């Protein structure tokens, strides 16, 4: 177990900004509907992504 | 002073004399004092006298 990426702050988004969340590898989201290997969606405004 | 909160800045209330008004520009979608929905960048005017 090697620490790939060291300690870092979280990623908080401003109310009038968004994140271009692109899936790198095929996976299933928490709601579980479907995601391609290369889908792109938009993390919305005020909040914080995991 | 808590650990979960941070004081971004101190804001001195701007004095508005009579026959004067303030031009407010909203940085985000929000409401105002009266209850009018303000979108980002939409400048409005407040004519209330005082501070």
Curated annotation (Swiss-Prot), chain A:
Positions spanned in the full protein: 103 to 152 of 861
Function statement: Required for normal vault structure. Vaults are multi-subunit structures that may act as scaffolds for proteins involved in signal transduction. Vaults may also play a role in nucleo-cytoplasmic transport. Down-regulates IFNG-mediated STAT1 signaling and subsequent activation of JAK. Down-regulates SRC activity and signaling through MAP kinases.
Lineage, highest ranks first: Eukaryota, Metazoa, Chordata, Craniata, Vertebrata
Changes after translation: Phosphorylated on Tyr residues after EGF stimulation. Dephosphorylated by PTPN11.
Coiled coil: none
Domain notes: MVP 3 mediates interaction with PTEN.
Protein source organism: Rattus norvegicus (Rat)
Extent of the signal sequence: none
Highest taxon in the source lineage: Eukaryota
Cellular localisation: Cytoplasm; Nucleus
Name of the protein in its database record: Major vault protein
MVP repeats: 10-50
Subunit structure, as described in the record: The vault ribonucleoprotein particle is a huge (400 A x 670 A) cage structure of 12.9 MDa. It consists of a dimer of half-vaults, with each half-vault comprising 39 identical major vault protein (MVP) chains, PARP4 and one or more vault RNAs (vRNAs). Interacts with TEP1. Interacts with PTEN and activated MAPK1. The phosphorylated protein interacts with the SH2 domains of PTPN11 and SRC. Interacts with APEX1. May interact with ZNF540.
């Amino acid at each position: 177990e090697v620490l790939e990426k060291d300690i870092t702050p979280l990623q908080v988004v401003l109310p009038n900004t968004a994140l271009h969340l692109k899936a790198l590898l095929d996976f299933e989201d928490k709601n579980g509907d479907k995601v391609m290997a290369g889908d792109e969606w938009l993390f919305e405004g005020p909040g914080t992504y995991i | 002073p808590q650990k979960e909160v941070e004081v971004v800045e101190i804001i001195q209330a701007t004095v508005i004399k009579q026959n004067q008004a303030l031009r407010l520009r909203a940085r985000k979608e929000c409401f105002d004092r009266e209850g009018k929905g303000r979108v980002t960048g939409e400048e409005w005017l407040v004519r209330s006298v005082g501070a």
